[PDB]
Paper text:
Collagen is a critical structural protein in mammals. The principal characteristics of collagen are its triple helical structure and triplet repeat amino acid sequence (XaaYaaGly)n; the Xaa and Yaa positions are typically filled by proline (Pro, P) and the post-translationally modified amino acid hydroxyproline (Hyp, O), respectively. Our lab has investigated the structure and function of collagen by synthesizing an array of collagen model peptides with novel biophysical properties, most notably by integrating the non-natural amino acids aza-glycine (azGly, azG)4 and aza-proline (azPro, azP). These aza-peptides have the α-CH group from one or more amino acid residues in their peptide chain replaced with a N atom.
To answer these questions, we synthesized azPro-containing CMP 1, H–(POG)2(azPOG)(PRazG)(POG)4–NH2, and determined its structure using X-ray crystallography. In CMP 1, one Pro residue from each strand was replaced with its aza-derivative azPro. This amino acid sequence was engineered to produce a homotrimeric peptide containing a total of 3 azPro residues when fully assembled. CMP 1 was synthesized on solid phase and crystallized by sitting-drop vapor diffusion (detailed procedures in ESI†). Herein, we use X-ray crystallography to provide the first atomic resolution crystal structure of an achiral aza-amino acid residue embedded within a folded protein structure, definitively illustrating that achiral aza-proline has the capacity to effectively mimic the stereochemistry of natural amino acids within the context of triple helical collagen. The pyramidal N sites of the three azPro rings in the triple helix of CMP 1 have N–CO bond distances of 1.42, 1.44, and 1.48 Å, longer than a typical tertiary amide bond length of ∼1.34 Å.15 This indicates that azPro's pyramidalization is connected to the underlying functionality in its backbone rather than the long-range forces of the triple helix. To further investigate the structural implications of azPro substitution in collagen, we compared the crystal structure of CMP 1 to that of previously published triple-helical CMP 2, H–(POG)3(PRazG)(POG)4–NH2, which contains Pro instead of azPro.4a This comparison indicates an overall RMSD of 0.36 Å for all atoms (468 atom pairs; H atoms excluded), and more specifically reveals that the azPro residues in 1 adopt the same conformation as the corresponding Pro residues in 2. Taken together, these data indicate that CMPs containing azPro can still self-assemble into the biologically essential collagen triple helix and that this modification does not disturb the conformations of the peptide backbone or amino acid side chains. In this study, crystallographic data verifies that the added N atom in azPro adopts a pyramidalized conformation and that azPro is a near perfect mimic for Pro in this CMP.
Residue numbers in the entry:
A (entry chain C), B (entry chain E), C (entry chain D): 1 to 6, 8 to 11, 13 to 24
């Protein structure tokens, strides 16, 4: 008969924007 | 009596922080 | 049969580049 559903593993986000202007 | 359990797929994280001060 | 698949948790991205000089 049918089995129950199996959560997957945890990639990184993209880089942040450039820092504060000097 | 049930079948065996089915892991799901691995999303990307949020943007990184702003970089260091200029 | 085995059940259906179970998505996992979403790291923050790296810091951005240095801010522009001023």
């Amino acid at each position: 008969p049918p089995g129950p559903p199996g959560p997957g593993p945890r990639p990184p986000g993209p880089p942040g924007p450039p820092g504060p202007p000097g």
